[model samples]
Target: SRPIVISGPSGTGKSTLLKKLFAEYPDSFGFSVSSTTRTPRAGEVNGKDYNFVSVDEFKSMIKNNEFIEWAQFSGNYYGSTVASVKQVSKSGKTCILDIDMQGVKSVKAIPELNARFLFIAPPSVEDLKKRLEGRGTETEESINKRLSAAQAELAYAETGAHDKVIVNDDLDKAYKELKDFIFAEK
Candidate 1:
């Protein structure tokens, strides 16, 4: 079984590419839904999009060593469980993780897991900032914070820690490269 970690800064269109991948290769990838402390959004269903646990429940899971990789972002908790990865592997599919840089570090520390890291990067810093601000989901302050994080994440991706870096300049081109890379490993 292959473990693929997909990470990038906010508004890099990583989620959009992942959705496309799921649609194109439905049987080849396993989506690892994370557990989050945030309340369910309008159309989100528990166990489908996220576990949607409370802060206390998340903390309890942490205490019990239930998570493989976990991190706090903007006062909310997000994590991937050991069981989630195992289930994916058991099904003979590549487990796909949509996480941040910190979570990538956490995932790397697990000796039993052999994971390949992939970074989805924006075309330019200016484009990234524009994308984030245009989303309107975050305040100006939050957008600034995300931009800072994006800088750090981009630097980290440049250090050769990730196996591949897909520049999201063109969605179709980037997605094709990702698809080729994944199957080429086999």
Candidate 2:
């Protein structure tokens, strides 16, 4: 099975759909274990939620050219290693990579993986704005920033970079489409 690379802008409920997919088919899908140079939260198991490592170890791995996509943010390092992805691939499960558009491009460049990209878009620009506004936790300024970012993501999706696009207008419908796409014979 090919790896499914899912990307979408903020407030698109991509996380919810992914959670549902894993919950609905526990053995059919798996996320590649990523490494992080941050303290693990409670109940976050090493080699599961993340491979917690020291900054020095992370830097060493970087020097060895091990990461597929790595970023330093909020004073911590996070990355997906090729080894971890290969591990998941050997498990005979469909690997699901929930990444941003930038990471999607990085994964696309890796021709050996033969990954399929999925873009989750909102029903409309107005619907996306309403969804973000209804969150109640975002500030007006933050919402504007998110909207702008979403515009860029949508524009990229229109460039036909993705293998499929699902409009997340309704959760159930979107999930059905997601499953159909993933389980459909290529």
Candidate 3:
């Protein structure tokens, strides 16, 4: 299966761009949701988005080696089981994973998945801050924490063997780049 693995900072408007793509071409892609204790990556559902469980349940599952890869965003959890791929792998479309930096490493390292890593970088630190604040429900402390974490991850992903990097400062252009890549194959 072809996997398009994407990661971005919190305020980079990654999710909005994705929403546009999915809205226009509703059937051309699938959100192959990961297992986690937190909410879904996108529009989550019991079978459609992902498998959610309590913290204790996920921890126990991890200990039992039920997952090939696992990642956590703060207290939230994410995982990939061997069977998750085929669930959303359909209609000649790519199975997309909207995971964090940690999840990308795990997905790429698996090698069995043959995944390609892509990143969305903010236009600038200032732009990032404005987006974060405008998005609502984010505090100064949370914004700073996200900035620090993203900067650290950005230091690696923006430079190295990334399959692609799309700057998301411009909504139309960034979505074009993403659409071109994901739809180019089909």
Candidate 4:
């Protein structure tokens, strides 16, 4: 079975659509548990939402080369552990990595997981910014920061680094495209 990797700018609907994939096919796919130092949001479970770990623990894992890829973002350490992907595959399921472009690059660099990555983008960055601001999920400053970071991610995402690129301009169309892409793998 082919593993799936996905990434995109903020407000691009990757996470939202990714959840649909999980819900629609509960037993076919599994997770690449990204470990993080940030506090889990309310109702998020440990090992399920993420493999929440202390900063020191994260650093130790870094020292041991335990992660396939990792990056420090907004003062938080986030890593996709090889063990997580292995756990998913060991269960006879294709692992899904919902990570960023840098994580995508890191995974590609790792000799173990040189797999194809899917890059999903909004119709345009302008639309992406507008959507994020309209969502009321952040202050003006934080939203700006998120979009600022998005610029770099978008640039990388558009440069043909990933294996596939899909513009999620229409919600329903994009969802169908994603489902077709994943199901075709099986």
Best by lDDT: 2
CA error at residue 34 for candidate 1, angstroms: 5.9
- Top candidate (TM-score): 2
Cα RMSDs of all predictions? 4.4, 2.5, 4.9, 4.2
lDDT of 3: 0.77
- Model 1 C-alpha lDDT per residue in residues 44-157, reported as the tens digit of each score: 999888988999999999988889877889899998887778678787888888778888998888756678888999998888888887777888788888888988999999
lDDT (Cα atoms) of all candidates against the true structure = 0.85, 0.87, 0.77, 0.81
Per-prediction TM-score: 0.77, 0.85, 0.76, 0.76
Q: What is the clash tally of candidate 1? A: 0
Q: Superposing every Cα of model 2 onto the true structure, what RMSD results?
A: 2.5
- Per-residue lDDT over 42-102 for candidate 3, one digit per residue giving the tens place of the 0 to 100 score: 6668766678788888898877766657778888988777457655565466677887887
TM-score of 1: 0.77
Write candidate 4's Cα lDDT for 37-89 as tens digits: 99988899998889999999999999988888788999999988888887787
lDDT of 2 by residue, 88-118 (tens): 8798987888888888888877676678889
Task: Return the candidate ranking by TM-score, descending.
Answer: 2, 1, 4, 3
Clashing pairs counted in every model = 0, 0, 0, 0
Angstrom error of the Cα, residue 180, model 3: value is: 1.1
